[PDB]
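Retro notes
What went well: the complex prediction finally ran end to end.
Inputs used:
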Amino acid sequence: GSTPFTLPRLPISEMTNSRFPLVIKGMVVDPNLPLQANFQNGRITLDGELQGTTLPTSTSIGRISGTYMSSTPRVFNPVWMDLTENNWTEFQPFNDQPAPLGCPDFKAKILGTLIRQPNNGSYYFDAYLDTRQHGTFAPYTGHAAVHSDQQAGHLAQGYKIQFSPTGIESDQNTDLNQLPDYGGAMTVSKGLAPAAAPDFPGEMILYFVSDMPVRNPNGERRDTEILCLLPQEMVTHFYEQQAPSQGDVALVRYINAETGRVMFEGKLHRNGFFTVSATARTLIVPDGYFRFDSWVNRFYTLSPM
Amino acid sequence: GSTPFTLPRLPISEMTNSRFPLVIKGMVVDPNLPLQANFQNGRITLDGELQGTTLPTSTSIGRISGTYMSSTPRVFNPVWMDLTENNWTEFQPFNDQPAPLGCPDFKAKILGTLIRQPNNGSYYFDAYLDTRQHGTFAPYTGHAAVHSDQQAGHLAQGYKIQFSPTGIESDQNTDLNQLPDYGGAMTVSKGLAPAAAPDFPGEMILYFVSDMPVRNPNGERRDTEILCLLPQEMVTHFYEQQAPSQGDVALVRYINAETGRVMFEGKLHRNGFFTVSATARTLIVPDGYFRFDSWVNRFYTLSPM
Ligand SMILES: [Cl-]
Ligand SMILES: [Cl-]
């Protein structure tokens, strides 16, 4: 009677990143990527329990929303936001959720626009959200500021506004595998999705990869990838099906879309991430799909990739 | 043995528009909206056959892509593109597809950015795509131009570039329910998704609604909605399941998410759109989900909304 667990029958090439609105360009396993992952977006259990700051669908990944504050709690001045969820429902600060759902889970100067909502006249202008700064990016406290030199005259106390990202600036310190300090100078622990980590020596996380759009001054080049543990279409699939997990870990096979050949197998863990048996950096082109084959015991040994 | 037809068990409030990257804010039936719909995005049959320019997932809705042409086939100069699909595979012009998949299917000055791809150094800058212009927007011919005053020095012949939209300018003539002229001055008919139209007097199309972001000079106000026939998550669901249709038309019920009460019923047509029995403008808040109940004969009479 219980809903069987399944994966979406879609090639990875047709999926999108769960941490930024981008297509998946492939997968990577690498001993020089972080051995454990702590992302807060793209986190769901296999039986459909959202974790961290993860949205169920791609409504507003990377966005923050709220109402304009005329006072704090080229020259770029802060635009302060009394934060809401991106669907404009209330966000309770200092509670059991690190930030509103969909809030960026990386540290960067994020470029984008600030959108005045239709009730106050649809308009938008350029702004950035610098998630490296404790003073203006502490969303766990219920407030955050974007920065803009284009806001003059367009906002008044209480206006609904939403930040929509286009990309980042990237420098020598950019590392998108580090979480921001959601509480600013104040530590936060409650409601974080836990570390995803293999428990088999010889297994590594299989990450899904996208290219992050970058706009540095004068076009300075520092190309940057962004990883996630689950493409958003897998998050939505597990959320929608709510299939009970019926074993320690899910055995999955990656199937070539053209030939139907089994390319490799992996473990899909209940906490929502993939591991494979590998020792060296391996790049997987996304012209295949994952197929759930069976629930297996935690001591199952994967065929080496 | 055949896959049963189903709808995604998600409230409409968690779905996104199939014609622009936006959340669905509700549904509308209205005798003063077009009685037939001709959108090319968000078109799929119930058994999973994509139509028009419709992508299976939200990879690149509203984008166009290609390689830079240094020659034609503030002051804003055209940036000419030898068009590809947005996944960088080849687009065959003058054939059986009106434009690359995901190409905008409305006429507007679409604001956004132009993205130089990582192989030539990740960088992006502001640009617009004016889909009202025959001379620079004829994607059926394999070429189109965006316009920019920020490109100087950043592009060379053959560079991969992608236009990503943020919103539109809107004026007194804006009407997003009219298709662009995909062939420019040359008519195009081949490969268009057909008109969606009720076949019951007393029934009207149930449209899904989003608010389009607008940026007019000086913040001039002209708020604009954009309609679609299917949210993209329904498109993806039907595409993924490939469920055979087992009757003339699908009977669906809209269920209140809180109470589980049946709010109204409608017909979900094989060509991929909803109709309901109504006479006057009716606005539906999206805090419910559609449930497939049975295949019915084409002469089935719906309970009035
Ligand atoms: Cl499966
Ligand atoms: Cl259903």
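What we learned: The helical segments of chain B are 232-241.
What to try next: split runs per interface for comparison.
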